[PDB]
Amino acid sequence: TNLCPFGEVFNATRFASVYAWNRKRISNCVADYSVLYNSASFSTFKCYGVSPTKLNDLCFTNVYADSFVIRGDEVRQIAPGQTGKIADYNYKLPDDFTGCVIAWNSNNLDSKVGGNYNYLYRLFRKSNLKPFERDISTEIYQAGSTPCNGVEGFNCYFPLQSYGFQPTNGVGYQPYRVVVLSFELLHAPATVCGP
C-alpha cells in the first residue's frame, strides 16, 4: 500500500502546545489525500497553491505536517499575512505559502471543567518569528526598564501563558486542533506522490 501515515498526525491522541509545535516529516509513500478532503470532521480546510483533489496527481520531495492546539479565535492567524500573538510569537507562515491548513474543534478532548492549564502559548517576545521558526525558550521577559536577572516579578513576565480551556467557553475560546501541511519541492527526487 505504501500509505503515507497521515492517520498518526491527524488522529494523534494529544497535540502539542503551539509554542512547542510538532513537525512530522512525511516521505517515501503514497498519500491518500481523499481521506482528508472527504472528512466531514474539519471545520477549516484552506489550501494555498494546491488543491486537495489535485494533489492525488502530484509528487513532492517531502511533506511536512505541523500540529498544535490554539483557541478558536486564533485559527485565522494560521494563514499567510496574519498578525496576532500566534502568528507573531508562536507559528508563522510565509507570505508565499504553498500548503493546506486544517483545523477542528477539540473541546470534547482538550477542555476540562475548572480549566485545562496544560496547553500554553507564547504571549511575550522581543521580535516576531520568521516563517516556520520554533521558540521553546523560557527566559523571563523584561517589560520595563529595570532588568530582571531571570526571576519573574513586576514587569518581568514568564513568557508563556496557559489557555485554561473550559468546555463552557464560547467557541472563540475553545481549543482547536490544527494541522498545517507544507509541500517541499527541492532539487532531489520527489518521494511523496498522490495516487
Epitope: 494523534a12 491522541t13 494529544r14 497535540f15 502539542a16 502546545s17 512547542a20 476540562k112 471543567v113 475548572g114 480549566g115 485545562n116 492549564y117 496544560n118 496547553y119 500554553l120 523560557t138 514568564f158 508563556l160 496557559s162
Partner: antibody, heavy 123, light 108 residues
Framework: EVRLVESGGGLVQPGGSLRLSCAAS????????ISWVRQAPGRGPEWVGF??????????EYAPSVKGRFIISRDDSRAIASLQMNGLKADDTAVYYC??????????????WGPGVLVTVSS | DIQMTQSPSSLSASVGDTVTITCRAS??????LAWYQQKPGKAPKALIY???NLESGVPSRFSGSGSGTDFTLTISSLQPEDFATYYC?????????FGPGTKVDIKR
C-alpha cells in the same frame, strides 16, 4: 499515541536506593505536572508526590511519609521524570505509577497513567 | 490532611442493575472529588472529576453527585465489563488522598 514508559521495577535492598524513570512521548512533556502514585498489594492508591510544569519550573510537593527520603525530578530535554528513593523500607514494596495531571493545577486528578512497575524491597 | 472513606466494601449486582457507591471526606472539599475505575492488572482509569463531570470517552451510564463531604457514584445499566474496584480521590489540595475502594462484582 500518548505513552508513559516506566523503568526501575524489580528487587531493591532495604537500605539501598532506587530510581524509577518515566519516559514520555506523544505530547508537550514540559507543560504537564508529573505525579508518582503507588499501590501496595491489596490496598488503594497513594499519591507520592509531583513536580509542576514549566510555569513553576521544578517545584515539587510530597506526601508527608516520603518527604526527605524520595526526590522527584524531571529532565524536559529528555522527556523524563524520575523518583529517586533513598530510604527504602520493606513497607515501600508496591506498584509505582507515573501519571499526568489532568488539569495542570494543584487541585488535580490523573487521566493518563503509566503501566505501573512492581518494586519489591527485600534483603 | 484529608481522610477519605468509602462504602460498601464490596457489592454484587446483575447485568442491567443500577449500583450506588459512596465516598466521604473528613473535611469540606466543595466539589473537588474524582472517581476512578481499576480493572485487574491495570492502572486506575479516571471516570468523573469535580464530583459530576465525565472524563472524555466515559459512558454516560456513569454519574456522580455530591458536594461538601459526602459523594455518590451511580452506575446505571451495569455491564460485565464494569467489574472493577472503584476509588474516590479528593482533588482539592496537594497531598491528594484516595478512599479504600469498593469492589463491584457481577452476578450471573
Amino acid at each position: 499515541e500518548v505513552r508513559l514508559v516506566e523503568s526501575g521495577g524489580g528487587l531493591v535492598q532495604p537500605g539501598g536506593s532506587l530510581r524509577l524513570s518515566c519516559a514520555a512521548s506523544g505530547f508537550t512533556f514540559s507543560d504537564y505536572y508529573i505525579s508518582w502514585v503507588r499501590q501496595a498489594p491489596g490496598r488503594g492508591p497513594e499519591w507520592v508526590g509531583f513536580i509542576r510544569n514549566v510555569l513553576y519550573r521544578g517545584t515539587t510537593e510530597y506526601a508527608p511519609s516520603v518527604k526527605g527520603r524520595f526526590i522527584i525530578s524531571r529532565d524536559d530535554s529528555r522527556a523524563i521524570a524520575s523518583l529517586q528513593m533513598n530510604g527504602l523500607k520493606a513497607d515501600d514494596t508496591a506498584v509505582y505509577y507515573c501519571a499526568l495531571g489532568a488539569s495542570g493545577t494543584d487541585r488535580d486528578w490523573f487521566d493518563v497513567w503509566g503501566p505501573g512497575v512492581l518494586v519489591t524491597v527485600s534483603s | 490532611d484529608i481522610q477519605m472513606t468509602q462504602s460498601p466494601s464490596s457489592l454484587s449486582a446483575s447485568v442491567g442493575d443500577t449500583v450506588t457507591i459512596t465516598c466521604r471526606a473528613s473535611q469540606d472539599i466543595s466539589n473537588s472529588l474524582a472517581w476512578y475505575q481499576q480493572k485487574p492488572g491495570k492502572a486506575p482509569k479516571a471516570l468523573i472529576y469535580y464530583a459530576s463531570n465525565l472524563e472524555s470517552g466515559v459512558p454516560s451510564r456513569f454519574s456522580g453527585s455530591g458536594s461538601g463531604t459526602d459523594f455518590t457514584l451511580t452506575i446505571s445499566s451495569l455491564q460485565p465489563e464494569d467489574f472493577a474496584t472503584y476509588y474516590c480521590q479528593q482533588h482539592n489540595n496537594y497531598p491528594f488522598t484516595f478512599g479504600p475502594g469498593t469492589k463491584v462484582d457481577i452476578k450471573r
